[PDB]
Design a protein around this nucleic acid. Structure first.
Ligand SMILES: CN[C@@H]1[C@@H](O)[C@@H](O[C@@H]2[C@@H](O)[C@H](O[C@H]3O[C@H]([C@@H](C)O)[C@@H](O)[C@H](O)[C@H]3N)[C@@H](N)C[C@H]2N)OC[C@]1(C)O
Lengths: 63, 172, 108, 386
RNA sequence: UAACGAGAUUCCCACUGUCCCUAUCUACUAUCUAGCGAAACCACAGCCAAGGGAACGGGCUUGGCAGAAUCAGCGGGGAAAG
RNA sequence: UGCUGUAAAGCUGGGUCGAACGGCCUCUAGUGCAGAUCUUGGUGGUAGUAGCAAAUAUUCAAAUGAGAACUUUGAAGACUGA
RNA sequence: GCGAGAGACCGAUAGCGAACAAGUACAGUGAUGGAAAGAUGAAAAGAACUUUGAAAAGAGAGUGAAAAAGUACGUGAAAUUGUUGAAAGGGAAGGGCUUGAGAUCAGACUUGGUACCGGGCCAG
């Protein structure tokens, strides 16, 4: 119900900003149980946590 | 505890209290006077319609420089208002008093609000900051609320006697 | 009386957002569609599909389309003690053109 | 000390207070003075302001630079379907003023005039005048006696007439009911004339002829709360004035130690009752005529309406009055037309006007065509024409 | 006395709502609502005219008069406040 | 609730209350308040009034919860712009 | 300083600043400056239990000599405020004098004497 810690830990573990962390809306209870970085890594491996793609900055117009 | 007014027959009455309630004294006084002496069900429906902005609470004493509304025409006023927090507090107290009356075996449909009053509770102090490094008061004006629900020779002179005797003899 | 019914409407949002503050146009279109659904369905309980929210905000805060084609369904709100036995669910309808379309009862 | 320089007062003290009018229907404060030898005739009529247009005319004023030359003039169109007479009122002279003795109504009243007696018509049982109509059924002797009362005692007789607002494009269904004084003949003649016109229609042409100078009573356009600068036309304070400049700088001297009634103040502007006089009648048009906008010099078969309709009014499809210039009120406003209160023999009052041409281009923009036919001729075929 | 100057001043060109003479538009207020909620100030108070009077009265004398409760504004007076 | 005294004041009926107090003859004083922009504390009118308007901007749905404009998640729309 | 005994002294805004976790809390860079605040009850017996409510609480109940003593606690004034009852009200209110009206209070049938004697009050 409050996944603030989980968002922060996922950002640290995955190596991206908090803005690029996706916590599964439909798996709230399991994510709320993930208190350690190890549980976060397990969720990341199984796709419950996902690294969002970068916002594209194409250089085609520049070239 | 001592209530300000005591019912004539306590077996047909139920009471409720709230003390040190952080709700405006002035708005609460207006809302308490709006339903004083009403049937309980009539008052509850009216308070629900107040929370809907379908009817308003008439503001009779604490109303200086408040707005005007056409929903005051029901009560013959132009200044009326919809104080939601006071209405919610009064509804909670009416519900508690109704529960007490039910526990005493009383009939809800016959209940009338026979007594209700609002008193000042002790103020709660906060601070506000003014220009030129000054400190002013920023206080609350809390309420004490109580309410009660109730089921709904001639002696004559000698000359006067003589006059009456003469008159009675004259008419048979 | 058919309580459960689905119809497709066209709302003229251009004339409803006339003169509106530019940073309130998309938020007011949300309120306008809710008032539109209550006018046609008779329910103050109006629910907007998140895809409708995406369509409203597609072109930013003041980029609302002149006309939107909407599917509105009146459905039973059993959910006892809810102040409304019915409710309206509003979702977008993808069409090639938003002109010339009339109110149509949708069969399911 | 005295004002350093002299200037006239801003605004007129004779139109005070500048408050909202009590009713939206402008009331006739005074009627024309009664002349007994004249034929029995109405003195006023109620219509609806529809809009403005343009005319072209030859001027007939010898000695003017524009004598026998064309002038372009603004005109106002008043939608005036016929009124229905539904009652009569008798007035008696008293040392305290005129007092109405009694009122007699017609047997049948239309729904539009009976809608005038209701604030919530759809929730009502429509009982208005339902027991009064029984006063006719038996033998109408009560009605005859009331009319005999009016003949015996009244010195002023006015008729009760209402508009047929359902003939206008207005979405309002309530008819406007007004008293129009009856002038000419004796009181008995007046009561007879009113009785014979019960439930009947009377048209504008039976009241106002063409070239007549008439008065208009209406309520002006509302503006809400206005500051002194526009309400009274006072001078704006300099640009660098602290706390603003759309103000009157001095609202009075130290003594009298009170703000005087003659000082300009912010307050409600417009929506006032006005009686404007001397508006010449350029045309009394007929609703049946399909060449209302046509003239002897411009023979296009044309109605008075402009292309697209009068903006925010609709189309004038009844009798109408074309008036020189502008009159108080707005589009849709009920306006009262009254005969002149004096006899005027100036050249402008007695001039016969002959309209060359009436503009019927669109009022919704820079309209450049007078007719759909002219537009089609100028533009040729279009894609939508096929 | 060349050069320099957020220094004082006059004229000129350009410019323009500074003005003739004002109009219209936008955002935020004001406004109305829910919640929250101060301060200055306060003998008692609060409609005018004249008189007399510490010689410019809300009160006193003589007149004019005088009808609940009020909202938005306003800057005449309270010889308003500081 | 009444009574006495010109008065300062004194006595008494009723209610509240819980541990000391008074009359008379004298003694003694840090002995009587409306004021001192008095002191300290408390409380009003003002007044539900002024106001809570800088820094572009929020929205839909789900979860939680007695309760969600403001918490969390998802989806968007934005901004800081090295 | 240490140990004692006293008073025509003060009695919680008094008496030392401090009767209390007082030179404390707090302020100032610093030297320094420096408060407020005593009392349920004999005894916590400090309200078990039931019920309404999300809860705070309320209503029953209970303890107590007293809850008109409920750890917002001895008594509990005034300013100021709510409710109830009575009354009054055309640009202030209040006051004196006087009477009316409405309310309240009071007295001689006496500490009365043996049906009478005799007395009190208001009046002709
Ligand atoms: C509960 N609040 C605490 C409390 O301990 C409070 O106590 C007072 C207490 O002193 C009062 O009691 C008082 O009794 C007398 C008399 C005037 O009442 C006073 O003279 C005396 O100073 C004082 N003890 C008492 N009546 C109410 C409590 N709240 O005193 C301090 C405080 C922080 O406010």
């Amino acid at each position: 119900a409050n996944l603030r810690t989980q968002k922060r830990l996922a950002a640290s573990v995955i190596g991206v900003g908090k803005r690029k962390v996706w916590l599964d809306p439909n798996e709230t209870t399991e994510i709320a149980n993930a208190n350690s970085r190890s549980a976060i890594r397990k969720l990341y491996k199984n796709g419950t946590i996902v690294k969002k793609p970068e916002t594209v900055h194409s250089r085609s117009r520049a070239r | 505890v001592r209530y300000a007014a005591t019912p004539a027959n306590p077996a047909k009455s139920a009471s409720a209290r709230g003390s040190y309630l952080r709700v405006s004294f002035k708005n609460t006084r207006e809302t308490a006077q709006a339903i004083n002496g009403w049937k309980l069900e009539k008052a509850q429906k009216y308070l629900d319609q107040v929370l809907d902005h379908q009817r308003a609470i008439p503001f009779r004493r604490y109303n200086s420089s408040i707005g005007r509304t056409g929903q005051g025409k029901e009560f013959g006023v132009t200044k009326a208002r919809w104080p939601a927090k006071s209405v919610n507090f009064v509804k909670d107290l009416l519900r508690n008093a109704q529960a007490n009356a039910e526990a005493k075996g009383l009939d809800s449909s016959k209940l009338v609000i026979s007594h209700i009053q609002v008193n000042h509770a002790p103020k709660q102090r906060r601070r506000t900051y003014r220009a030129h490094g000054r400190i002013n008061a920023y206080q609350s004006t809390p309420s004490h609320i109580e309410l009660t629900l109730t089921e709904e020779q001639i002696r004559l002179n000698s000359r006067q006697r003589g006059r009456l005797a003469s008159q009675k003899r004259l008419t048979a | 009386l058919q309580d459960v019914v689905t119809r497709e409407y066209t709302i003229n949002l251009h004339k409803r957002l006339h003169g509106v503050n530019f940073k309130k146009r998309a938020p007011k279109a949300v309120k306008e569609i809710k008032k539109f659904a209550t006018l046609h369905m008779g329910t103050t309980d109006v629910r907007l599909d998140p895809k409708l929210n995406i369509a409203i905000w597609k072109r930013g805060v003041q980029g609302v389309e002149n006309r939107m084609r909407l599917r509105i369904s009146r459905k039973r709100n059993d959910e006892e003690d809810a102040k409304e036995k019915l409710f309206a669910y509003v979702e977008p309808v993808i069409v090639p053109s938003t002109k010339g379309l009339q109110t149509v009862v949708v069969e399911d | 000390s005295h004002r350093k320089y002299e200037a006239p007062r801003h605004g007129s003290l004779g139109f005070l207070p500048r408050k909202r009018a009590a009713k939206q229907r402008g009331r006739v404060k005074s009627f024309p003075k009664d002349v007994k030898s004249k034929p029995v005739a109405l003195t006023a009529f109620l219509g609806y302001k529809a809009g403005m247009t343009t005319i072209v005319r030859d001027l007939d004023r010898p000695g003017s630079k524009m004598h026998k030359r064309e002038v372009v003039e603004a005109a106002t169109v008043v939608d005036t379907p016929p009124m229905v007479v539904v009652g009569v009122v008798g007035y008696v002279e008293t040392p305290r003023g005129l007092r109405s003795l009694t009122t007699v109504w017609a047997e049948h009243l239309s729904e539009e005039v009976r809608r005038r007696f209701y604030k919530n018509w759809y929730k009502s049982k429509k009982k208005a005048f339902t027991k009064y109509s029984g006063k006719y059924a038996t033998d109408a002797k009560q009605v005859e006696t009331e009319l005999a009362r009016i003949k015996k005692y009244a010195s002023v007789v006015r008729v009760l007439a209402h508009t047929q607002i359902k003939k206008t494009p207005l979405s309002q269904k309530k008819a406007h009911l007004a008293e129009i004084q009856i002038n000419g003949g004796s009181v008995s003649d007046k009561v007879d004339w009113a009785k014979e016109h019960f439930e009947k229609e009377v048209s504008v042409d039976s009241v106002f002829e063409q070239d007549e100078m008439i008065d208009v009573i209406a309520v002006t356009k509302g503006h809400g709360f206005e500051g002194v600068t526009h309400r009274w036309g006072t001078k704006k304070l300099p640009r660098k004035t602290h706390r603003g400049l759309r103000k009157v700088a001095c609202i009075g001297a130290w003594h009298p130690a009170n703000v005087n009634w003659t000082v300009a103040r912010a307050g409600q502007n417009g929506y006032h009752h006005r009686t404007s006089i001397n508006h010449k009648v350029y045309r009394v048009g007929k609703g049946t005529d399909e060449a209302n906008g046509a003239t002897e010099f411009d023979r296009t078969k044309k109605t008075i309406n402009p292309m697209g309709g009068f903006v925010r009014y609709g189309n004038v499809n009844n009798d109408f009055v074309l008036l020189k210039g502008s009159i108080p009120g707005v589009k849709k406003r009920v306006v009262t037309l009254r005969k002149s209160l004096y006899v005027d023999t100036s050249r402008r009052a007695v001039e016969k006007v002959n309209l060359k041409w009436i503009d019927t281009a669109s009022r919704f923009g820079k309209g450049r065509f007078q007719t759909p036919a002219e537009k089609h001729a100028f533009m040729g075929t279009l894609k939508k024409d096929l």
